[PDB]
Recover the amino acids of this structure.
């Protein structure tokens, strides 16, 4: 009966052991390529078209 | 929000990371050259009295047959601009063909 | 369940990684401009009173 809500803004500098365990994911505007790649390397259900929306996302749009 | 004037061309292809424009005639290009170079900015319509701001990445001129020419441009999107003049970062919706494009005063 | 009205186009290709649609006229397009933009959804028939749900990734006007 213990759960987490980890947060960050540059995830590439975090222990991946922990990220590995997260089931549901959320994201917002991303612009730094490194983060894009490190994320896409991990997300289960990421299509291709979706991957190209991140930079063009507005504020609040998630 | 000021006036914009006559357009120059219209859209022919859209995508999440690319937009293409075709230009109507030559004289317009001959006139607007200085404002059609790389790096510069363009305005596009997106319906509901809005506008999209875009940048340029490539130009082209093709030869036509029956000399005369036909000009093409590529772009990249940045953000939105309401009717008032407020700039917002990131676009929510995108435009479609047969929509007009205007120069940046 | 409800009624959908009238179609707008037809199919000209099929594959597990892509589908392609063509348009009837320019007037139907001029009319439903505001629902064929990227990110939107469509409906397709596959026989047997069923339907398929698809999204959009590209438009062109030759």
């Amino acid at each position: 009966g213990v759960t987490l809500m980890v947060v960050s803004q540059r995830p590439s500098e975090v222990s991946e052991t922990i990220f590995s365990q997260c089931s549901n994911f959320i994201s917002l505007r991303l612009t730094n390529a490194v983060d894009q790649t490190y994320v896409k390397s991990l997300l289960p259900d990421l299509s291709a078209g979706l991957g190209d929306l991140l930079p063009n996302l507005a504020q609040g749009e998630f | 929000m000021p006036d914009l004037g006559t357009p120059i061309g219209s859209v022919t292809d859209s995508s999440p990371s690319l937009i293409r424009i075709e230009i109507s005639s030559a004289e317009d290009f001959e006139k607007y050259k200085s404002m059609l170079g790389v790096g510069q900015y363009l305005l596009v319509a997106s319906g509901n009295n809005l506008y999209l701001l875009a940048s340029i990445t490539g130009v082209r001129a093709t030869h036509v047959e029956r000399g005369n020419f036909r000009f093409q441009i590529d772009t990249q999107p940045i953000g939105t601009l309401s009717e008032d003049g407020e700039f917002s970062r990131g676009s929510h919706s995108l435009p479609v063909p047969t929509e007009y494009a205007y120069v940046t005063p």
About this structure: Residues 33-40 of chain A form the longest helix (8 residues). The helical segments of chain A are 16-19, 33-40, 48-51. The two ends of chain A are 28 Å apart (CA to CA).
